[PDB]
Design a protein around this ligand. Sequence first.
Ligand SMILES: Nc1cccc(Sc2ccc(/C=C/C(=O)N3CCOCC3)c(C(F)(F)F)c2C(F)(F)F)c1
Length: 182
Amino acid sequence: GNVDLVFLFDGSMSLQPDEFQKILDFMKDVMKKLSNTSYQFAAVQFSTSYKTEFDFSDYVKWKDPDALLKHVKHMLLLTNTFGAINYVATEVFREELGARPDATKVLIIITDGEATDSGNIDAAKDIIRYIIGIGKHFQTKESQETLHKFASKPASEFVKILDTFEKLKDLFTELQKKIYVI
Ligand SMILES: Nc1cccc(Sc2ccc(/C=C/C(=O)N3CCOCC3)c(C(F)(F)F)c2C(F)(F)F)c1
């Protein structure tokens, strides 16, 4: 019933300042809409390295997406997606950061490029993983397909590709049509 949800977001060099900002604003739009629910949130920037920008405890105490993300600094480096996802699994989904042990775990990966590292995500198997790939880096079917190994199956359900960063506005509109009292 409880959902612990991590936004794992790309801070690579390829992102223009306004593109990075549109990611930030997308995350806030989502959290604001799901205020006062069974959702609790944390946000991790990844590039070459990984940074938990805020954790579940931070979210619980303040409940203010704007404040929680105010101090994000765009890393401007690589796109170490394998390491990032592994970092979330082992270093973010923990009591110490406010995670609830029995909650349903959800990861929302937002990226504008293919991974710069390699390996596996065995450690993240218990997490429901969604991945949003954005921009001209994902023009080809082959580039979209590379994202599939990161997300839960089927890709048709757990993978979304967006032509541009403006389409995050549109995805948020669509998302809200999937909100129900169950
Ligand atoms: N089709 C597709 C593919 C890739 C990305 C997306 S975007 C997305 C998707 C799902 C969710 C939330 C899911 C959620 O909370 N669930 C469904 C799984 O079971 C637990 C509840 C969410 C969230 F808003 F609730 F967090 C998104 C979001 F965040 F808008 F990106 C959509």
